[PDB]
Amino acid sequence: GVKEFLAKAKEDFLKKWESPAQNTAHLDQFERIKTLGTGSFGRVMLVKHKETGNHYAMKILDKQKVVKLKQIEHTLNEKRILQAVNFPFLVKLEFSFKDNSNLYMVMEYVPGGEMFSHLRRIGRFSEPHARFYAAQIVLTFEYLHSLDLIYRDLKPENLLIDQQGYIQVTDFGFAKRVKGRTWTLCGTPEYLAPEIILSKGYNKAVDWWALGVLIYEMAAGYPPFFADQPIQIYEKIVSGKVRFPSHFSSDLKDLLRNLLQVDLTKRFGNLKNGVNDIKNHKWFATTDWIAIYQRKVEAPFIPKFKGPGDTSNFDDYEEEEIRVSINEKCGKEFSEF
């Protein structure tokens, strides 16, 4: 079943992890169309592959900025891990390459937009709607964690809706293959586990805390800890007191109390029964986990789609020239990319 699947999945992952694909396209092979999104580190553009006419989403990282923001090892992690993984709810990396100035990761284009934009516009998701997305994240973390991968940036901005209404996780920028503790201060403020904020060594349990934040935000329409500035948010997270909307079901509150749990001996996901504490929780009782994996469940909604290269489900961004210096930057640092 899942055991045999995960075993084969690890065999497949390790082969790619040990022999990563490198230099599999070139910038001139793509027509750049429009910026789909930006973050702290990269710009992602809709591009069209000239030879096939396929559309893709191309993440562009300026090498010099990666260095200034101390993201060199993280960016090498990002590409090495994304090229090696394979799961129904993980975005596919199709090509990667670099030039004098930039690093490029060419992904499948997920046209339905960020979960973030739908969530903010609609206000909040009903519990069955939130549950459908949450189940996909549960299965995805089960897969990533079985490969010794921590994800470390779960948030609606990093979750895309595909044409069938299912989730595609993007942004593997903080993904790391690690068997023991790790210590890097990274993530997004609203989603950080208390042990990250308090500079403890931490583990994959921080992804399960972040799932608690995600489910809360999806079902409430706002995060469980919010403020005007990150320092204020961190105070609230470490305080740890959560209040729930009146409309939250008893089962949802119980699940969230077990995910947004400061005590690592008690946090679901982290215990002897592993992910099954979550899968068998009452809030998920109606969830058919195999049907979700097989993408046979009818999705809560289907994004509007007007054409292959339509970007209506994404906000507009100021466009910035892709400049390529006549001199190689940071050659040694990104040799393996």
């Binding site: 901005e157 201060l185 990274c186 403020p189 995060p223």
Partner: peptide, 20 residues
């Protein structure tokens, strides 16, 4: 309401990652 307080807050738009 909590919703009103969130909507009036300065972090209702897209949130980028932190570092350092």
């Amino acid at each position: 309401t909590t919703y009103a307080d969130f909507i009036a807050s300065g972090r209702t738009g897209r949130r980028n990652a932190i570092h350092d």
